[PDB]
């Protein structure tokens, strides 16, 4: 077909079968692709109440119709499965090259079922698929796993894999691809580990079918020109990476410090993208077909070269732990990529532990055997905790599954900066009202990128809003939630929003898939359908709307100092308005009229 390949790879690890199925084009179009196609597939094939580490969970790797097409940022794909860290839907995105090889191999999506009786890996070369013994790879870090597979797979194969953390079912385990790219949050890597799946190698020799090659080329050249002319997409991101945000968020007084105890630090420029570019940066590391190139390639203190850190990583191993050692952040990022864990949950769990120590919940005797401290700014101890958390060594075992469970153990849940048990990232919502809505209602838990209200409230895209204001924020958050669901579903990068809007996405989709398949209104409505489908999945999984909240600190403790001094998030007023503008009930339940309007009639009367 055009855009979509038309084929799905179903792999049952108990029966050790690899079978081809025809893609349901109607469903793939109705849910756009990638995210939406994966969630609908999972919802249709599992009971959401199941334990996410049970063999009955499904591990889905899905691409979008634009994944692999000659358009800007077409290297994106997603992992969809029940998320074991949160109990919610798991929707984790990754770039690099792996997903493009899968699409060039003729597959739009892989559904992995059940569990292998021993560690295995999947080897794909176009339509050739084999399950093989992975006993000699089990236990190896991402880089070594990749090098070992390169010795026994076809040249040019890309590697997707879990590290030791995923093998041990850590709830902060990530899915790694291309050595340093990752579908990281939700503990999705532990689902792969629960299936005894160590890796999937993929080589694709095909091309993505285009309905109109020359039109696609004309549309692509136009969008790239806009991105290259945009100050952020054309200059800031390529030069400083996402790390460009350090000084921006800090100057607005919404950069979390010491586990959100503060919101501003006069040391932030030591870990800025400007400092990184002037020192350890070797070069950009752009994903497939990407003119932005925000990817970082850096030099570790020992001279080793490797993928560099993103903004959220610079924050969680820097300001959040009271550390301002940039070399150390580069090392921590490498260690998280090698062990296969989400940087954000890792650093913010260490930050929660440092606060529990600050407040006397953790005693010196409990960590003496580890020979590490939990003192703010102790960079060496912070780095040392990573390995101990991954392998459950000494006190590290209490941090292996995240801050929410760690703080519950000490009877101090108030020190876990999480929503649905997932750690909130590097933006203090007390000074960003619309963005705080995203954190509270995000279907995948505490997360900023499924609703980056940072764009309009701080960066001025597509317009500048007053971040302290309340009027209009609920509706704006809904729009960003639905637009992000479209971009995730297409197989493109969210950073295209630095220059592009809905019509640009319609232009690229129609040029690739077929003239007039979607219009700006129908496509955004599809994003609303996808977000609402995720909500129904969470309701079926037992995730009540009462889990739409923020830590008490962010609702009651005014920011103590800085440009946002005095502010708290006003969720009490914004959440009901968010449900209302979504067409949901006061208990956050999609109404019968809303389900009919979104084409979700099969779910009427069930919630
Ligand atoms: S903007 Fe960055 S994350 Fe997005 S596709 Fe390009 S290099 Fe990758
Ligand atoms: Cl679960």
Numbering used by the authors: 1 to 607
Reproduce the article's own wording on this structure:
Here, we experimentally validated that ethanol production is initiated through a tungsten-dependent aldehyde:ferredoxin oxidoreductase (AFOR), which reduces acetate to acetaldehyde. All these oxidoreductases contain two metallocofactors: a [4Fe–4S] cluster and a W-containing bis-pyranopterindithiolene cofactor (simplified here as tungstopterin). To solve this metabolic riddle, we characterized the native AFOR of C. autoethanogenum (CaAFOR) by X-ray crystallography, biochemistry and enzymology. By performing the reversible conversion of different aldehydes into acids, AFORs are environmentally and biotechnologically relevant enzymes, putatively valuable for synthetic biology.
The crystal structure of holo AFOR, refined to 1.59-Å resolution, and its biochemical characterization provide new insights into the cofactor chemistry and the specificities of this enzyme, fundamental to sustainable biofuel production. X-ray fluorescence measurement on protein crystals confirmed the presence of W in CaAFOR and the structure was experimentally solved by single-wavelength anomalous diffraction at the W L3 edge. The crystal asymmetric unit contains two CaAFORs, which have too weak of an interaction to be stable in solution, confirming the monomeric state, unlike structurally characterized homologs. However, the overall monomeric structure is highly similar to the structures of the homologs, the AFOR from P. furiosus being the closest. The tungstopterin cofactor of CaAFOR exhibits a canonical composition with two pyranopterindithiolene groups, stabilized in a ‘bent conformation’ by the coordination of the flanking phosphates with a Mg atom. The W atom is coordinated by the dithiolene groups from each pterin and by two atoms modeled as oxygen according to the electron density. The W–O distances in the CaAFOR structure are, however, substantially longer (around 2.2 Å) than the W=O double bond modeled in the structure from A. aromaticum (1.74–1.75 Å) or detected by EXAFS spectroscopy (1.74 Å). On the basis of the observed distance, the ligands were modeled as hydroxo rather than oxo groups. One of the hydroxyl groups establishes short hydrogen bonds with the perfectly conserved glutamate (E312) and histidine (H448), a position that should be occupied by the acetaldehyde and acetate molecules and reaction intermediates. To evaluate the CaAFOR redox states observed in the crystal structure, we incubated the as-isolated protein with an excess of BV2+ and barely detected a reduction of the artificial electron acceptor (with an estimated 0.1 mol of electrons per mol of CaAFOR). This suggests that CaAFOR was crystallized mostly in a fully oxidized W(VI) state.
